[PDB]
């Protein structure tokens, strides 16, 4: 990718990286007495999924966030509990 790096006389830092494959931007910062943060990716529709009625597929189509099948060997009650534990979705 392309890295735009900034570093001050006190060792504050800003790193902006854009991926040369996808064109997605990633940002990280460091304080004088700290390490770099994890890479904050640019915003995307998938980052809203915790608040929506629908999941967002890789083609950008909508679907249900919970699908329960007899192959799963789970009760509906356990599938609700597992879904809330995995996602934090309340509705």
């Amino acid at each position: 990718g392309f890295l735009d790096l900034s570093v001050d006389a006190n060792d504050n830092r800003l790193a902006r990286l854009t991926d040369a494959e996808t064109g997605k931007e990633y940002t990280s910062i460091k304080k004088p007495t700290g390490t770099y943060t994890a890479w904050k990716k640019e915003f995307e529709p998938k980052d809203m999924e915790k608040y929506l009625l629908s999941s967002i597929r890789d083609d950008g189509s909508a679907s249900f966030p919970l699908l329960v099948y007899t192959s799963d060997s789970k009760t509906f009650q356990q599938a609700i509990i597992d879904h809330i534990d995995r996602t934090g979705q309340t509705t």
Binding site: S6, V7, D8, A9, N10
Partner: protein, 92 residues
């Protein structure tokens, strides 16, 4: 287009006495005021002054004690302790 400071002008000769390259350097120990500039001159005509951006100790410069909207030189700075114009809750 800068703050008035004491300067040294270095004049580089060419194929004729009517044309020169000029370098200009500001005479300050303050890392925010020390600047290198250059241009081409031909008779009464010239380029504009080409400002060369230095990195103090190979780092981005620090700005403080002013409104962030009063900064008027391009480039990348660390900003802290600004007197106004910042976004809500952003200190640096």
């Amino acid at each position: 287009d800068m703050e008035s400071l004491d300067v040294v002008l270095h004049v580089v000769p060419l194929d004729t006495s009517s044309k020169v390259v000029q370098h200009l350097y500001t005479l300050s120990t303050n890392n925010n005021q020390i600047k290198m500039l250059y241009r081409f001159v031909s008779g009464n005509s010239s380029s504009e002054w080409q400002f060369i951006q230095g990195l103090p100790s190979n780092k981005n410069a620090v700005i403080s004690g002013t409104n962030i909207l009063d900064i008027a030189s391009p480039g990348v700075y660390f900003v802290m302790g600004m007197t106004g114009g910042m976004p809500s809750g952003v200190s640096s």
